[model samples]
Target chain A: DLAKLGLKEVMPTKINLEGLVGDHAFSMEGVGEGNILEGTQEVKISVTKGAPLPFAFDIVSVAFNRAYTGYPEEISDYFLQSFPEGFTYERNIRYQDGGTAIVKSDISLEDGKFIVNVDFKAKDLRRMGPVMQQDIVGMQPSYESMYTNVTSVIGECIIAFKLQTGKHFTYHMRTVYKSKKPVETMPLYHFIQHRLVKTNVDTASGYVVQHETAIAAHSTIKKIEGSLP
Target chain B: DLAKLGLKEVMPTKINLEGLVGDHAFSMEGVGEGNILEGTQEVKISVTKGAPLPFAFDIVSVAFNRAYTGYPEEISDYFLQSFPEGFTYERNIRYQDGGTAIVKSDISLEDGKFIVNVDFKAKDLRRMGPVMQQDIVGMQPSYESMYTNVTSVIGECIIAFKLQTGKHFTYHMRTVYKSKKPVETMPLYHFIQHRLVKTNVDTASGYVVQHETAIAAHSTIKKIEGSLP
Candidate 1:
């Protein structure tokens, strides 16, 4: 049954940047298409090097971790069971072209506090599924060792990346992805109505406004990152 | 005098996110940001339940130790110095509203691939610089610890959270200066020229770039996640 798979929360926090860099040189990279292609873009940030707050960052990873990390507790309280410590999956948020790029630092540190530059790309827009015991054991030996006697399978890796700082550095990323071919098979669902379903509701009335009528025959994901400091 | 800092590439490594979720989620969060106040709207994702990726992701930690554990040589190749085993840092990617979401499953493992619902707003944007330090230490805690003890200063955090998916994530950011108030500052040329002295760039470049520049700015970071599987 759908209830069998458990999820939970691990940790939660927030950071407010409005106070540091003031209002300038901030821009956003727009969203692109779904899986099956590499998406790319650039973010420009002009900062004052000797400014009171000089900073640097890297594009680590990107994925679907967004859905679970921050919820309203009560509406998402029950989800904690499945991801007590939270879940991590793979996405795209890296510059395949790994190197540093030094842009112009125009603003004065005294006048401008900080500036951020971000850019990222992604490829292969498909979600991953449960890994077989044998494969899982090979992929994550540490986790597999713990569930030696148990069989636990979860969803695919979303997207993610890592960032480093404290240096006069810059970089470019090229996103890439591969297909998960030679798929595996599993038994059919016997208890048809027992599976989880999506339903739209009225925020005010709290009513089942409409039940999800169709199942998505296909789905895809994308990863993109830019800079702001 | 600025050249004395002697900033250089310490370590660098390339990661391929084939099928890991948490790793991708964690890293992106460390180097991601959103600028909402600049008229950039927030992101919204809607995935039906029972689908392969019914939720999002949140990254807990991505350490240099994890990379070293897999390939010790990566330390020397990516960083300037070698680090002992087990170095890592945790980037808390939490929801702005303070909650976690879910990732549902599907019958076809391929269709059940990971999907990204949102790519805006990250935990601790203001403290992104300090937090990024934690990421550096995650790779070489002892080395960073020693360096911090010797130097009482560190760079600020600079990053951008770009959305590549066919979704939208807005951003709002602001900066407040605590120095001689703007009213007390002299005319634009005098003010900018004085600050330009800090940079090594030619007087012409600094003069043209900083002369009469407006103060304050904002923008939106949109999703562009795609390919790179």
Candidate 2:
């Protein structure tokens, strides 16, 4: 029965970014949709399209912590689950939005289930702001307790908010059938998530992405962040 | 000097979301940019465009915790610092992303300093993601510790990811003068954040907005998540 929901495979000792190194750090295996994470995770970051690595990064941070602390110490081996890491030249990357936003690392066997698939492409940044967070550290998970645990686990994150006058708004993504466990501090006023948890509200400096819920009793999420008819 | 860097006025016993209840839970002050959050809390959320709001909600969780305990408990008085809460609706709401995502609840005096200002509308959601996190619950923050403390305190989050063959990608925004303090979990292979940070990678499935960094030593962040050539 879908392996009874055990779900396996979890890799990535590390995979740093910014031009992605080597050949843009390589690794791939079927990606996702239904039973996603077909398996394998040492690295996978493709950025082709313009591929002009002059360098300008504003921010794109990640952490899983075995004791990684946070990150810095000489690029922390890139985060070391070690796939060797890459950066050179190649082609075949295509998904276009603003265009070129790929960073995938999925290895699910346990320790933390795994599925950290971040995406973007609407026009590349100048400002996305302060933050868009998600949290969970140490303890919790004899089987559950990312927070009291809900729909077990279900998430979908799509974002876009680039405004200062250039123009390019609305096209939000926020899904929840059952949610919240580890992710606090990144308020937009979503009082702890629940079934149908809501997502849609953007404008004013612009920046957010959260997940939270439960002492018990929840369900009140709605989105329409913005763009206009 | 601005209260000698003490920075005060932390309000919002609570400010629940989705149609935002009680005339759409209300409040306001100067809002942000530099001195951002002139100050005022308890509640402040406005949604006026078409302003229809029949109600549909998907996900928009939030928390600060003194021990409120995750959330739900009979709507938890909407998080009560008690402005009284409302639902009559007048109008002024305007920002425009997809279209309308506004959840503001500021206080700034301490406990959690407060500035949970969420926004949206690029078109009001159908999907964004299963999640977008930001964390920091117990310990840390004695003098400072949101995570070793980067650039002291600086954040900016702007999201837009809508895929399922709907099409509307890239416009990305990710900033970091010095980032990450709390906001673990939510990976897309971005080994802890550093200066220049980086945010620009989008194509498959789509959904991400992160912030992380440092035991010490960092600087590499770029964004262009994507839309297309």
Candidate 3:
């Protein structure tokens, strides 16, 4: 009967990220409202050697926090839900006119750590209008309609497990139009990292502790390596 | 147990459409690949003289039908659903350039008749884009992209009702991009009509009687008479 309730089957219970292993960090700052409001966010995660037994180096922890200044209550409400513990799973980079690039990632939590995996694919920008055309280049010289770059990221985290107790809980966070900056073109070389750890008290009490941190970075490609074979 | 299954309560065994009583019809002709298609629809419902007993003058009959010529099968699929019996319940007009208008209606069936009610509300075309602007005037010299007009309508009908046996059935149809016509701007007058009839034999034989007709028309306003108070 519960299966008939149309709930998505949560599978694989665990994730593996072999190539992305190490420390990572990202920070951004921006101003808006003619310098009336300013905000900043910084995230860092590192993978290190664990002690022994249940504490393996393969498992790491993560943490993330952000703050804002001089923003109105109405605008702050749009971001209040983003102030939670999680790793970004989806992102979108939008240009001022109308062009946009969508980014998505698969995320999971296990062994007191948050794991995030991402892949990229190319898409043709077709049926573009004046707004999208102006985003890439310019036909007029109006500063108000100039190209503006903005980013939005959403993340999720599981808070409790209840296969027998019958009570499950999860946490989600959304960062909309966060770290908005002006740019001319799309960026390449996106990077993300996450770490988690459990304290000795948690291991002794027979509870799975959660301590996670994550960082993501995206950059433009500098040059090509070689011609296609 | 049926309530637990989420069944809707069928109340108001009768309906009143005194204000909506009238005659309506719609026809359209357009070209895609050298005179692609042309179609016309007509609907009529009158409260006139009836035979006697269960059928009285208070209960009238309705009729609707449509025909097309030189239309492709792929495009015909768009309006095939509209050919069924019932009145337009909901309509959505979407432009390729991100503009959309949503239309909804109130519908009911009673006394062997289907009643449909709809009202119009004024909206400003303030945030229109270049395509919509060029649709009105001032654009490149191509008749192809010079403001194409399109409309889609959906209808539903109560096909059978077993009052003595407490059994009922209904059918729904969708018309996607029903009529595609080139225009200068968005039209103002939009009309839809539907009629359904059931004879004594259908109720006596314990079977469904699907005698239905429907017509929908979309056109520009010829004149405006009212001013905002």
Candidate 4:
């Protein structure tokens, strides 16, 4: 009966739905019977902390107050605000990497009513440096191999949220870095990537399913401490 | 108390006082508080009927309507309607009798609000037999007297009214007729002179008052029917 209201549509592959979590599965998270907004719908996400990954923070998760009964795939080219009604993306900033990078997603029929999908592309791997150390602790990489400067390592992060109300939210961020690299090729690299890690899933309610499909592989490099012969 | 309001000047003449009746004395009438129509108001009089009397009912009465207020008399030209809205007199029809007539009255008022005195002027007299039978009323004599088939007569009936209510309200009128004839030439001229009459005052309440001043005295007529003969 709900599909009779024109709310049903086959997901378009053009929308990057690679790896989604929370409302991405269309679980009852953000759906609402009535929202305060008038013209268009709105969603907000926030991430407290996360590792610097190869990809820019581009993915978004939405949880409505009620079941969205309208065709979700139709959402397009709309702007996203940071805080509830506060900040928004800078003008030149866009979901660019491959194609237009922007994706259209909607509430899923398979999941709970409140859930919507994550429609974004992975960030460029070139922006991230080479992987230096790999250990049991987690994935660790040197910043020099990753960025030109210890600070010039312009990096981005993704934050995941599970508000007390069971509604989940997330935020992706990009941090600018200033490098002081020397003119000569001195093999010095910062271990910023070691600190870069993914958000831990709160197993109390649900495990953080590795959205691996959303992640792209990066090239690994090996450099000895001694000079090259 | 009314004296303080400047009602004294209205009765400047005995005739003016006699004209006032009811609460409207020769001096002042009862006025409501805050009514702008107070003070020595200027009134206009018109006769919308009984013009060119003794000549039958063939005439238009003078129609009067209030033009303005105050002793300063702010009223402008008499109009069928107010300034931007008035009837313009365009054509004039002259009688073959040398008397000229127009379809409208070109009467107007001065700023001082003199009772807008107006009357058709009679230029000359006629003595021809046929002319005497036609243009004798007023001063203008018939042209036929100098030609043929003309007779002249005199006297006029007027319709008078106070300006505000206009000809809707009753007033008074007087008519004067004179003849230019010798007793021998026109034998019945003596009887006609003996029969000269005037007006009777008609008040709003339908009361008719005959006054001595409303009558006219007959003087000797100098010429009988004269001219082409």
Name the candidate, 1 or 4, with the larger DockQ value: 1
Kindly report which residue stretches of model 4 are placed more than 4 angstroms away from their true locations once superposed: A1-37, A40-106, A109-112, A123-229, B1-229
Candidate 4 local Cα displacement, residue B161, angstroms: 80
Q: Candidate 1: which stretches are off by over 4 Å? A: A1-229, B1-53, B57-82, B94-229
What lDDT tens digits, residue by residue, belong to model 1 across residues B1-229? Answer: 1012122112222211112232223222111111211111112111222223212221211110111111122111111111221111222222222322222111110121111212222333323322222221110000010011111111111111212221111111111111111111111100000000001113232210010111111101121233111
- Candidate 2 local lDDT, residue B170: 19
Candidate 3 off by > 4 Å: A1-176, A179-229, B1-89, B92-122, B127-132, B135-229
Ranking by lDDT: 3, 2, 4, 1
Candidate ordering by DockQ (highest first): 2, 1, 3, 4
Q: Using DockQ as the measure, name the better of candidate 1 and candidate 2.
A: 2
* Model 2 clash number: 187
Kindly list the per-residue Cα lDDT of model 2 for residues A84-177, writing each as its tens digit.
Answer: 1211111112111232333333322333233333232222422322211111111100000011112122122222222233222222222221
TM-score of each model, in listed order: 0.16, 0.24, 0.18, 0.15
> Each model's C-alpha lDDT?
0.17, 0.22, 0.23, 0.21
Supply the global lDDT for candidate 1: 0.17
lDDT of 4 by residue, A1-229 (tens): 2233222222111112333221222221222221112112232222322322222222333111112112122221011111111111111112212212233334333331223443333233222222111111221111111112222222232222222232222222333322122222211211111112223434354322111101111212222123110
